RNA sequence: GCUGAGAAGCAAAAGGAGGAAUCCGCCCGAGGAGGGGCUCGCGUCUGAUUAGCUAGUUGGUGAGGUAAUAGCUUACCAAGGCGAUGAUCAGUAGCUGGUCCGAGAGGAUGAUCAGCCACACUGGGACUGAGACACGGCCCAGACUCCUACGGGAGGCAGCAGUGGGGAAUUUUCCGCAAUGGGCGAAAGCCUGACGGAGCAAUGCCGCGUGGAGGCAGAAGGCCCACGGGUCGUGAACUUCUUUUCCCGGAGAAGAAGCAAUGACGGUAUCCGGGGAAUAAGCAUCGGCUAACUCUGUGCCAGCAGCCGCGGUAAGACAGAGGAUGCAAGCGUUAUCCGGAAUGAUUGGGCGUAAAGCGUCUGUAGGUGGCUUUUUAAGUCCGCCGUCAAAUCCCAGGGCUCAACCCUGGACAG
C-alpha cells in the first residue's frame, strides 16, 4: 500500500465493534414475554440441565434467554426482563434474564452477592 | 540515475559500511556536493575527494573507523531518508527536530542553502527536510 | 468517608503507618502466625504503596485520583508534587504541628470548627494551605484547652522547616511548600506514580 | 482573492467558455498533493478565446446559473 | 438598533453581569461585536471601557434602563 | 426624488399633549450602524451487486418578472452541461463551535451551553407589513377529536406544567415579575410558563459525617486448629473529649438600581445559645489476568462463568460460614463509544512456505523521474496585517470556608 494512489483511493475500513446482542437493540435490557420455559443441555465437555426461557421481546425479536440462580418461578406467559451476556455452554442462548425484577422473583435463600440476583437483605 | 539521486548517495553509505568497506564512489551533483560538504565538517566521515574517470567528476568518500575490533567501527552510522519523492515533507522553524536531543542532525533545504539544525535553528527559517542521520 | 475502622490491621499489612492512627507500634500481643513466606506479586507491592499513602492521609481514593490528575497537570516531578499537594492539606499540618495526636484526631478537630485560618474559620479538612499562612485555635480554645493537651503530649518530634509554632499564642505558619526530604513518610514516589499510569 | 488561471476547454457557445482549473490540494489523512480539476463557465462579450488558450477567472455579477465569471487575460510574467 | 444591555453570566444566586452591545432582536445571552463592560452587583468592580461605549453611543445604540443608570454613575456622557 | 437621450411630465403631508415654553410625531429625501436577500472559491457520510444522466436541460437574444443578478419565466436560435477524481439513483444524517477517547496522528460523536437552518396535524396557496409564505394568523384539500337543538360549527402542547400510549427510562396540572431581557406607552404602568426561583430523583461531578483519645491484654461468643492454640480484636464492652451533622430555641442578610419605596426566593443562607456519641455502612470479589482463602454441604447434580474452563467425594472456581480484599454513599451487572488494537498500518503492518503477487505481456488515462545554467514563485519558508463569535480546553490571578462551579486577563498552535 503505497502512500500514492493505492491508499488515497482507500485502505479499507474495519466494520464496527459488531453487536454482541442483536436484540436489546436500543439499549441495555428489555422487557420480555415468556413463550417456552424448556431445558437444554450444554456441549460435550460439560454436563448439566440448564433451564432457559425462550422469550418474545418488545423489540420485535424472539430469543432464548438463560435463567440464572437456583429457584425459578417462571411459568408460561409471564413477563421478564432480559439482558445481554453470552452463556458459553449453550448454543443459541445469547441473553440472560434479570432476577428480582418484574414477575421474576429473587432466588431462594441467598446471602452472598445479592445484587446480581435481586434478593433484599435479611437480618 | 534511478529515481533518486539522494537515496543514491545515502544507500551507497548504508550499503558501504554495513559491509565495513570504508570507501564510497558516488556521482557529484550539486546537492550531493552540498551534503558531503555539510557532512565532512560534522565528524561523520573523513574525506571527500572529487576526481574524474571519463571526465565525469565523482566523489570518493572515506568513512570513519576505529581500531581492530569485532567490527572496526563501533557506532553504527544509521542513515535515513525522510522526504521521499512523491511524499514531500515540509517543516516550519517550530517542527524542525532535535534528533535524539542533538546527537543526530537533520539536513534540510532552506532558502539559504542546505543547513543543519544548528544552522537553520539560529536562522529561524524553515524548509524541506531532506533526511536526518543519527 | 473516613474509613473509621480497625487500624492495627492496616499497620500490620502496610507496615508501620507513621504517626497516623498511632504513635504506639503495632502488635504488642500479636503476629504469632501467618508466615508470608516471601510470595507477593508486584501489583500487591504497588497497591500497598497506594494504601500506605491513602490511609496515612485519610483520603478517599477518588479524591486521590483527583490529586494525581492535578499532580500530572502541574509542571515538575509528579512523584514529589503529589507529596506537596498532600502535605499542605490542612489536617496533615494540624497533625504535624502536634495540634492533635492522630490524623483522625486532626480531621475531627477541624470538623467541629475549631480552627481559624488568617482569622477566618475553615470547616473542611481538605483545605490546602499556602505559603505565609496563619493557623490558630478558636477563641473558646483558651477556655477549651484540648489543643493544649495535644501540644503537651506532642513535642517528642519537633517540626519540619515549613512550620513555626508559637508557644502560648498557639500560632503555626508555613514558610514555604514542603521539600521531599521534608516529607515525613518514607515511600517511593516512582512506585505510586507508576501505579496510576494505567489510571 | 486570487484569480483562477486555466485552459479553455471548448467554446462552442456564444460569449461562454468552459475552463479547466487545475488545483493542487493536500489530501487530508495522507500528506500528498493531489490535483483536482474543476471546470467552469466564464463570460466574454468579446468571445476572443479559442480552444486551448488559458485565462484567469475573476468573480463578477452572475450572468446565468453557471456563468458567474468573466475572464480577460493573464499577466504573463513567464 | 443595537441595544447595550446586560447578560447574566454566573451560577444560581450569583448575578455577575456583562454589558454587551448586541442587536436587540437577539436572545438575552447571544453574541456581540464587542462585549464592552462588566457589572458585579454583589460587591466588586465594573470595568467600563469608555472609548467603546462612546463608539456605540456615538453611533446611536441606546442602552436599557440600568445600563443607562450605570452610565449615569460615572461621567461617561460627553456629546462629541 | 423618479422616468426618459433630451423634450417633457410625474409625485407628499397628521395631528396630538401642554397656558405658553416645548415635546412626541408625520411626508419627502441623503448617510451610517445593525439586521436581512443573493453569488462564488474551499471543506462537508456510505454503496458500482446503481453507468450513464440532463431537453428550461446548458448557453444566446428578445419580451416580461423580482427589493436585486439570474432559465426566475416565456418565444426563437445554438447543442450544449454533469460524470469512472463516481455523475444519476438508492440509503443514511440537521450542521458547527464543541464532547469523549487517544501519547500522538487522529477515531467516534453533536444532550444540556451557544450560533446558523428547517418544521409547526399531513399537504398546497396566497394576503399585510420594513420583514413571513407566519407554531399559538387567514383560505382550501386530506385524516383525526369535541359540540350540536342535526342545519352546521370548533381544533392544532414538537410552549410550560399535565394525562394516555409506546418504552428498561426521564419530574410539579408550583411561586414570582424582585432582577435580567423583551413588547407597548409621553409618563404612570401593564403583560411575559422567556427568565428568576422552588419541589422530586444518588442521574452526574465535587465536599462532609457515621466519632476523637485511651482501652487490664482479663472475661462472653463465632470460625478454624497437629487440641497447645490462633483469629475475629483495641475491635467491642468500658472511661473521658467534641457536636460537622441531628433536635430544641433566638438573631438574621446582600441580592435592589443614591428620591424614597420596591424580594417569588424566605424568615431561606449564615451566626449565637442548650442537651447529646448521640441520628447515621453498604456492595462487589477472593482459580490465573486480579489485591483477597480456609472450613462445612453438594457429588458432571445444583450451579458459576468476561476468556481459559471448574463441577463424577475431602472443590483456594458451585452454595453457606468465618476471614480477607477493593471501593464507599455508593457498589455491581448490562448496553453504547474510544483505548488496549501496530487487529485498516501517514506516523505504524504484510504478500517463498503462516491470509495474501493478477498466468504472462503490450499500452491509454494517471503517478514518479537523470545532470548543468537561467527565469517566474504555484507549492515551500520568513515578517506584518485581517479573521476563525462568545462559552469550552491550556496558563496565570480572583471569588464562593475549599473543591466542583463561577468570573477577569493572556496565548501557542492550526
* CA distances to C65, C111, C158, C177, C178 from C161, in Å: 28, 26, 10, 9, 8
Are E54 and E6 contacting, i.e. CB atoms less than 8 angstroms apart?
no
Asked if strand F comes closer than 7 Å to E42 Cβ, the answer is: yes
* Residues C77, C116 share a domain: no
* Residues B133, B91 share a domain: yes
Are C53 and C86 contacting, i.e. CB atoms less than 8 angstroms apart?
yes
Contacts of B36 (CB under 8 A, 6+ apart): B9, B45, B48, B59, B61
Chain pair B-D, CB pairs under 8 angstroms: 5
Listed resolution, Å: 3.7
* Contact across the interface for A3 and D30, Cβ inside 8 Å: yes
Domain carrying residue E69: 1-80
Please spell the DSSP secondary structure of E29-71, one letter per residue.
S---S-----B-TTT------HHHHHHHHHHT----HHHHHHH
Domain carrying residue B66: 1-76
Are B58 and B52 contacting, i.e. CB atoms less than 8 angstroms apart?
yes
Are A85 and A95 contacting, i.e. CB atoms less than 8 angstroms apart?
yes
Are A83 and A24 contacting, i.e. CB atoms less than 8 angstroms apart?
yes
* CA distances to B130, C52, C170, D34, D56 from D25, in Å: 22, 58, 73, 5, 19
* Residues C112, C75 share a domain: no
Number of domains observed in the structure of chain C:
2
Q: What residues of B are in contact with residue A4 (Cβ under 8 Å)?
A: 86-87
Are C102 and C22 contacting, i.e. CB atoms less than 8 angstroms apart?
yes
**What's the CA–C1' distance between A58 and F165, in Å?**
14
**Residue B103: CATH number of its domain:** 3.30.1490.10
* Residues B133, B109 share a domain: yes
Compute the distance between CA of residue B62 and CA of residue E18 in angstroms, rounded to an integer.
73
Structural domains in chain A plus CATH codes: 1-123 (2.40.50.140)
What residues does E2 pair with on adjacent strands?
E23
Compute the distance between CA of residue C25 and CA of residue C17 in angstroms, rounded to an integer.
9
* Contact across the interface for A3 and D34, Cβ inside 8 Å: no
- Which residues of C in 145-174 have their CB below 7 Å from strand F's atoms? 146
* Residues B39, B82 share a domain: no
* Contact across the interface for D32 and A4, Cβ inside 8 Å: yes
Please spell the DSSP secondary structure of C99-165, one letter per residue.
SSSSHHHHHHHHHTT--EETTEE---TTPBP-TT--B---GGGGTSTHHHHHHHH-TTS---TT--B
* Residues B59, B19 share a domain: yes
Q: What residues of B are in contact with residue D32 (Cβ under 8 Å)?
A: 86-87
* Residues C92, C80 share a domain: no
Query: Residues E58, E64, E67, E72: what is their CA dihedral angle, to the nearest 10 degrees?
Result: 70
E19 CA: nearest nucleotide by C1': F180
Determine phi and psi for B6, rounding to 5 degrees.
-110, -35
Please spell the DSSP secondary structure of C33-69, one letter per residue.
S---TT---HHHHHHHHHHHHHHHHT--HHHHHHHHH
* CA distances to A115, C69, C93, C104, E3 from C1, in Å: 23, 20, 20, 11, 52
C-alpha cell at C74: 502541574
**Residue E10: CATH number of its domain:** 3.30.1320.10
Q: Where are the alpha helices (DSSP H) in A27-122?
A: none
- Which residues of C in 108-147 have their CB below 7 Å from strand F's atoms? 108-109, 111-113, 120-128, 140, 144, 146
Compute the distance between CA of residue B112 and CA of residue C6 in angstroms, rounded to an integer.
74
- The SS3 call for residue B99 is helix
* Residues C171, C112 share a domain: yes
Contacts of C84 (CB under 8 A, 6+ apart): C177, C178
Number of domains observed in the structure of chain E:
1
* Residues C168, C95 share a domain: yes
Neighbours of chain B (3+ CB pairs under 8 A): A, D
* Residues C80, C29 share a domain: yes
Asked if strand F comes closer than 7 Å to C101 Cβ, the answer is: yes
Compute the distance between CA of residue C144 and CA of residue C134 in angstroms, rounded to an integer.
20
Amino acid at each position: 500500500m503505497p502512500t500514492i494512489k493505492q491508499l488515497i483511493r482507500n485502505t479499507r475500513q474495519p466494520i464496527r465493534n459488531v453487536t454482541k446482542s442483536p436484540a436489546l437493540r436500543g439499549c441495555p435490557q428489555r422487557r420480555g414475554t415468556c413463550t417456552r420455559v424448556y431445558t437444554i443441555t450444554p456441549k460435550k465437555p460439560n454436563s448439566a440441565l440448564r433451564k432457559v426461557a425462550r422469550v418474545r421481546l418488545t423489540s420485535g425479536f424472539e430469543i432464548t434467554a438463560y435463567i440464572p440462580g437456583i429457584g425459578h418461578n417462571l411459568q408460561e406467559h409471564s413477563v421478564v426482563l432480559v439482558r445481554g451476556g453470552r452463556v458459553k455452554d449453550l448454543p443459541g442462548v445469547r441473553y440472560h434474564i434479570v432476577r428480582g425484577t418484574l414477575d421474576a422473583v429473587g432466588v431462594k435463600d441467598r446471602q452472598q452477592g445479592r445484587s446480581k440476583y435481586g434478593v433484599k437483605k435479611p437480618k | 540515475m534511478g529515481k533518486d539521486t539522494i537515496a543514491d548517495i545515502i544507500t551507497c553509505i548504508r550499503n558501504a559500511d554495513m559491509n565495513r568497506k570504508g570507501t564510497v564512489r558516488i556521482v557529484s551533483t550539486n546537492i550531493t556536493e552540498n551534503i558531503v560538504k555539510i557532512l565532512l565538517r560534522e565528524g561523520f566521515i573523513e574525506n571527500a575527494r572529487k576526481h574524474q574517470e571519463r571526465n565525469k567528476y565523482f566523489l570518493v568518500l572515506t568513512l570513519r573507523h576505529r581500531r581492530n575490533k569485532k567490527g572496526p567501527y563501533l557506532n553504527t552510522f544509521h542513515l535515513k531518508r525522510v522526504s521521499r519523492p512523491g511524499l514531500r515533507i515540509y517543516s516550519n522553524y517550530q517542527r524542525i527536530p532535535r534528533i535524539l536531543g542533538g546527537m543526530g542532525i537533520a539536513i534540510l533545504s532552506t532558502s539559504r542553502g542546505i543547513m543543519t539544525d544548528r544552522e537553520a535553528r539560529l536562522e529561524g527559517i524553515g524548509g524541506e527536510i531532506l533526511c536526518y542521520i543519527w | 468517608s473516613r474509613y473509621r475502622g480497625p487500624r492495627f490491621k492496616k499497620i500490620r499489612r502496610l507496615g508501620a503507618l507513621p504517626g497516623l492512627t498511632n504513635k504506639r507500634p503495632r502488635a504488642g500481643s500479636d503476629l504469632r502466625n501467618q508466615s508470608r513466606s516471601g510470595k507477593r506479586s508486584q501489583y500487591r507491592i504497588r497497591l500497598e504503596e497506594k494504601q500506605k499513602l491513602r490511609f496515612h492521609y485519610g483520603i478517599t481514593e477518588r479524591q486521590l485520583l483527583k490529586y494525581v490528575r492535578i499532580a500530572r497537570k502541574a509542571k515538575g516531578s509528579t512523584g514529589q508534587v503529589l507529596l506537596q499537594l498532600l502535605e499542605m492539606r490542612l489536617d496533615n499540618i494540624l497533625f504535624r504541628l502536634g495540634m492533635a495526636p492522630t490524623i483522625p484526631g486532626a480531621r475531627q478537630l477541624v470538623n467541629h470548627r475549631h480552627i481559624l485560618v488568617n482569622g477566618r474559620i475553615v470547616d473542611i479538612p481538605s483545605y490546602r494551605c499556602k505559603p505565609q499562612d496563619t493557623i490558630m485555635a478558636r477563641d473558646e480554645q483558651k477556655s477549651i484547652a484540648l489543643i493544649q493537651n495535644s501540644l503537651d503530649l506532642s513535642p517528642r518530634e519537633e517540626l519540619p522547616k515549613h512550620l513555626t509554632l508559637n508557644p502560648f499564642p498557639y500560632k503555626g505558619l508555613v514558610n514555604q511548600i514542603i521539600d521531599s526530604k521534608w516529607v515525613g513518610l518514607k515511600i517511593n514516589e516512582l512506585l505510586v506514580v507508576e501505579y496510576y499510569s494505567r489510571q | 482573492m486570487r484569480s483562477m488561471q486555466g485552459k479553455v476547454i471548448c467554446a462552442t457557445n456564444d460569449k461562454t467558455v468552459n475552463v479547466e482549473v487545475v488545483r493542487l490540494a493536500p489530501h487530508p489523512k495522507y500528506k500528498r498533493r493531489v490535483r483536482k480539476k474543476k471546470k467552469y463557465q466564464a463570460h466574454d462579450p468579446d468571445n476572443q478565446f479559442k480552444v486551448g488558450d488559458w485565462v484567469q477567472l475573476d468573480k463578477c455579477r452572475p450572468i446565468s446559473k453557471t456563468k458567474t465569471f468573466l475572464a480577460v487575460a493573464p499577466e504573463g510574467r513567464q | 438598533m443595537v441595544k447595550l444591555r446586560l447578560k447574566r453570566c454566573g451560577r444560581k444566586q450569583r448575578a455577575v453581569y456583562r454589558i454587551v452591545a448586541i442587536d436587540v432582536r437577539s436572545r438575552r445571552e447571544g453574541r456581540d461585536l464587542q462585549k464592552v463592560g462588566f457589572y458585579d452587583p454583589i460587591k466588586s468592580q465594573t470595568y467600563l471601557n469608555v472609548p467603546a461605549i462612546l463608539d456605540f453611543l456615538e453611533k446611536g445604540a441606546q442602552p436599557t434602563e440600568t445600563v443607562y443608570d450605570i452610565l449615569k454613575r460615572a461621567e461617561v456622557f460627553k456629546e462629541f
